[PDB]
Design a binder for these strands. Structure first.
Lengths: 63, 832, 114
RNA sequence: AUUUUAAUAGCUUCUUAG
RNA sequence: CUAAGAAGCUAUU
């Protein structure tokens, strides 16, 4: 059931790339660093904090 | 227990053991401590950096903590002794080298005082003090004064691969040999460096036997070249790194001054000058037009000077004013495959029904940081008689072929949809650059690149691939002209190796149609008690010595004895060393310089990696064979092999064919191999590797430590303890034994998470049409057949999931029909 | 023709770059050689018209360049633009410790020879 | 935007067979 | 109409 967190994260990063927010590089380095931190996890609630942070990111911008 | 170098009639080698009145002739020389020290000798410092293992590395530890180079509290830190993860270990090694210079100059004052005295005798490396004194005499002989000879081959030859690690000649860059004094200052415009380099060689290495030539075009065979270049690695760290490379010349045409090369000043291959030179051009010819357009001297003068502090490398210029960085795209998710993949009762928790591998994404500054991975390259320079024996043993693994020069009428292209290379890659592809000239022009450019040297420019950009580790690897890309000479100069042997079925080198031949049973029957050929090995080299593309690359290039052109003379081979070797070893490589709009190693885009790359793997294999067997005691091994033939081996290295000057054939017979019979460019399985006799007649894990650990300077962990290597089941990993495949028909056939099967991971992560949204995925999914079904016979049920569930999804895609859009297993079992029938 | 067009494009490549070259400065460095033969790496090093340096962080700028002027390779320089990855001119009075969290790095500078 | 190696599927030509 | 072998082109793993 924790592969669903990874597939939702990779389809949201696929959304967030074509929103064209790559040029502001300072948030983009942190977002790709936390995406790399998502895929190498073993506990769920820490990963749940990571994905609700990424949903806060993709509901934050109006791109 | 210390280390000793022994040349007796009984036992010869370099291993651990259990342990006159000529003094009144040499009593007034400042090199001999007076007779009746330091406790640790110099040869133990030679030995422990050549024979390194963790757990018995205590002697290196008191040798470093004795001489105030380090305290004892840096060593309770975890992970201290590796170059690849501790980059600060090279500083505490670097404090040793002034004692090494005080050793060598004291030997010069020993030898010059010996030759005037009249003593004929042979020098041994274990007799040195660490301060510089020599003390052990007792086997010399008297002669006429001013005519005594030294024999200095063994000391200097075994001393070579630690001088460039400990940086013993970094103190020649001062003013008058004191560290506190300032550095020596040159005029910038010097490019010769001949007279003072020669007096440096007759200061430090004055009594060496064979004549060193500071240039290599004067040289007379194909074995003075390795001699002169192996000395020239060590001497090329003193001189400042501005004054190395291409040169300029002023020429007038069309009322416009130009600039063009006339010769090169290499790190290794000396000084070569162009035999063709013109003062003025009257017209334009297309050969010289390609010569002029291939040169980046036309690009280097029209650029701004660059000072980079991101990396630790040297730079020349930036070609444009504007610097930009690019990003690695992430991938796409197939939700239809996952949506039907949960409908077959799959993807639970509480088990291993999950996924491992994923795509990864990298930032804008990943590319220049991936160039920064060349900082593990070091100046390394190797043994000289050991490499002279290795270069003749490796000839008999490859003298089963036919090869030679060709013409332009009999060249075979594979594809014509490629890239071209800088600066040609803005107008035409490779097909336009074969459509331009004729056959006579390609004969002329073969004849003219045996008379002149050309520079090129390496283009670099990124690639996208599936990984299990968050990392990027980019590409290397070589321009047209050196490759277009390279096809004519090498392509006969390139096709002659890749069309013979069954040999040591296993490239070309195929795993299908019962090929894998022939593979593993050739592995288990004549051995008696077999186990299996296997390893992967840690970042082999990013770090390699330059002597091993040049000696790998010279082996691959022994075959041209009926077409070309020596100078034509010299210009081909000079163009090869100028285009694969030290080329001004570009990384993102800025012209850098490459320190050395293989580019990953040349034509002769993978075969050079195969003969490179053969080179560490045969150096590991000779290093394991020399470093054991002669008073334990039972077989008399092994003992006579040991003594004639050590005599054939360090006491003979020509070649001996009979011992090369006998050593090739031994290494064929008891260390049978199978190598495809990085990855090997070998088949050792397990009665001997506990005794110590052949290599093991630990000898490969030691030889990769001292000659390549990259650590290899114990977790990556492995050893399989069964004859029946095969290798654990071999080119990322797994091996079992399957009953099929009336006998047993080796069916190789992949990782299951690779098969589950290759389908749901596609790299293109346009690829979600099924027109490519029908042959992609049936090729993956061919690749995932041998999970069916496995006794664990979940891989058969994966196989049936793929079968039902193939049936679903065939509904949405026996023997010859692929939707039944009768087609896929016909693929692994051994009869075609 | 393909041959004539590749000769045309290579001809305008080798003729449209002759701006920094065809100068008196190449004559000023080529004259004192013993045979008119100089190493290539010091062809730009005497006659560079500009200098550009990449800077990764604050402390390398504390070591490297201070104020409007500095010295590399026995030559004086004067700094005119400092530019970042968004291609904007970042200012000189702002570069200190107190803004080192906020702005986006690495940076690119440029200058002219005095 | 690299180099080399095999396998499948599709097209077309020549040859042999009824 | 079909089978087998060889050659050239496109496209995939």
């Amino acid at each position: 059931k924790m592969s669903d967190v990874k597939c939702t994260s990779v389809v949201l990063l696929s959304v967030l790339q074509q929103l064209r927010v790559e040029s502001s590089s300072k948030l983009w380095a942190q977002c790709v660093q936390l995406h790399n931190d998502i895929l190498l996890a073993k506990d769920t609630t820490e990963a749940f904090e990571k994905m609700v942070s990424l949903l806060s990111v993709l509901l934050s911008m109006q791109g | 227990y210390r280390a000793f170098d022994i040349y007796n009639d009984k036992v010869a080698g370099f291993a651990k053991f259990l342990k006159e009145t000529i003094y009144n002739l040499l009593k007034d020389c400042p090199a001999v401590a007076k007779h009746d020290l330091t406790k640790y000798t110099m040869a133990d410092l030679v030995y422990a950096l050549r024979h390194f293992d963790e757990g018995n590395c205590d002697t290196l530890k008191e040798i470093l903590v004795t001489y105030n180079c380090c305290d004892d509290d840096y060593f309770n830190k975890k992970d201290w002794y590796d170059f690849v993860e501790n980059p600060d270990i090279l500083r505490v090694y670097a404090n040793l080298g002034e004692r090494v210079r005080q050793a060598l100059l004291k030997t010069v004052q020993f030898c010059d005082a010996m030759r005037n005295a009249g003593i004929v005798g042979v020098l041994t490396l274990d007799n040195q003090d660490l301060n510089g004194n020599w003390y052990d005499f007792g086997d010399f002989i008297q002669t006429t004064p001013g005519s005594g000879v030294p024999v200095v081959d063994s000391y200097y030859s075994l001393l070579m691969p630690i001088l460039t690690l400990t940086r013993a000649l970094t103190a020649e860059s001062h003013v008058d040999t004191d560290l506190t004094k300032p550095y020596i200052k040159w005029d910038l415009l010097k490019y010769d460096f001949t007279e003072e380099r020669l007096k440096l060689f007759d200061r430090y290495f004055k009594y060496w036997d064979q004549t060193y030539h500071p240039n290599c075009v004067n040289c007379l065979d194909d074995r003075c070249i390795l001699h002169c270049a192996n000395f020239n690695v060590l001497f090329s760290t003193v001189f400042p790194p501005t004054s190395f490379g291409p040169l300029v010349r002023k020429i007038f045409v069309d009322g416009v001054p130009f600039v063009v090369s006339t010769g090169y000043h290499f790190r290794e291959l000396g000084v070569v000058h162009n035999q063709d030179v013109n003062l003025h051009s009257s017209r334009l010819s297309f050969k010289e037009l390609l010569v002029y357009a291939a040169d980046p001297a036309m690009h280097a003068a029209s650029g701004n000077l660059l000072l980079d502090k991101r990396t630790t490398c040297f730079s020349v210029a930036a070609l444009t004013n504007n610097v930009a960085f690019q990003t690695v795209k992430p991938g796409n998710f197939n939700k239809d495959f996952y949506d039907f993949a949960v409908s077959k009762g799959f993807f639970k928790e509480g088990s291993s029904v999950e996924l491992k591998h994923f795509f990864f994404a990298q930032d804008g500054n990943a590319a220049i940081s991936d160039y920064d991975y060349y900082r593990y390259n070091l100046p390394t320079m190797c043994d000289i008689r050991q490499l002279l024996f290795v270069v003749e043993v490796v000839d008999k693994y490859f003298d089963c072929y036919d090869g030679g020069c060709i013409n332009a009428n009999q060249v075979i292209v594979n594809n014509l949809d490629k890239s071209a290379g800088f600066p040609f890659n803005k107008w035409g592809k490779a097909r336009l650059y074969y459509d331009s000239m004729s056959y006579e022009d390609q004969d002329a450019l073969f004849a003219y690149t045996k008379r002149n040297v050309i520079p090129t420019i390496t283009q670099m950009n990124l690639k996208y691939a599936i990984s299990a580790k968050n990392r990027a690897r980019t590409v290397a890309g070589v321009s047209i002209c050196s490759t277009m000479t390279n096809r004519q100069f090498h392509q006969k042997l390139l096709k002659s190796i890749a069309a013979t079925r069954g040999a040591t080198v296993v490239i070309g031949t195929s795993k299908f149609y019962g090929g894998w049973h022939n593979m593993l029957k050739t592995v288990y050929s004549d051995v008696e008690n077999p186990h299996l090995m296997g390893w992967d080299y840690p970042k082999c593309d990013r770090a390699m010595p330059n002597m091993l690359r040049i000696m790998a290039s010279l082996v691959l052109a022994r075959k041209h004895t009926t077409c070309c003379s020596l100078s034509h081979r010299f210009y081909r070797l000079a163009n090869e060393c100028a285009q694969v070893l030290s080329e001004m490589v570009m990384c993102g709009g800025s012209l850098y310089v490459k320190p050395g190693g293989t580019s990953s885009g040349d034509a002769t790359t993978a075969y050079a990696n195969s003969v490179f793997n053969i080179c560490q294999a045969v150096t590991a067997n000779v290093n394991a064979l020399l470093s054991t005691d002669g008073n334990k091994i039972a077989d008399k033939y092994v003992r006579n092999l040991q003594h004639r081996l050590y005599e054939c290295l360090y006491r003979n000057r020509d070649v001996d064919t009979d011992f090369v054939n006998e050593f090739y017979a031994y290494l064929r019979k008891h260390f049978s191999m199978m190598i495809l460019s990085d990855d090997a399985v070998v088949c050792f006799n397990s009665t001997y590797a506990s005794q110590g007649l052949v290599a093991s894990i630990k000898n490969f650990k030691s030889v990769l430590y001292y000659q390549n300077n990259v650590f290899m962990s114990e977790a990556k290597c492995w050893t399989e303890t069964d004859l029946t089941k095969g290798p654990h990993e071999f080119c990322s495949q797994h091996t079992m034994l399957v009953k099929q028909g009336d006998d047993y056939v080796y069916l190789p099967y992949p990782d299951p998470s690779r098969i589950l991971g290759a389908g749901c992560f596609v790299d293109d949204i346009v690829k979600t049409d099924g027109t490519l995925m029908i042959e992609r999914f049936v090729s993956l079904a061919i690749d995932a057949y041998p999970l069916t016979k496995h006794p664990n049920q979940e891989y058969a569930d994966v196989f049936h999931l793929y079968l039902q999804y193939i049936r679903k895609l065939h509904d949405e859009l026996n023997t010859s029909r692929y939707w039944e297993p009768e087609f896929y079992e016909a693929m692994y029938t051994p009869h075609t | 023709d393909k041959r004539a067009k590749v000769t045309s494009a290579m001809q305008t490549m080798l003729f449209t770059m002759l701006r920094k070259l065809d100068n008196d400065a190449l004559n000023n460095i080529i004259n004192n050689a013993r045979d008119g033969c100089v190493p290539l790496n010091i062809i730009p090093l005497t006659t560079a018209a500009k200098l550009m340096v990449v800077i990764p962080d604050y402390n390398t700028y504390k070591n490297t360049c201070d104020g409007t002027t500095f010295t590399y390779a026995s030559a004086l320089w004067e700094i005119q633009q400092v530019v970042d990855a968004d291609s904007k001119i970042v200012q000189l009075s702002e570069i200190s410790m107190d803004n080192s969290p906020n702005l986006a790095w690495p940076l690119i500078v440029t200058a002219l020879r005095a």
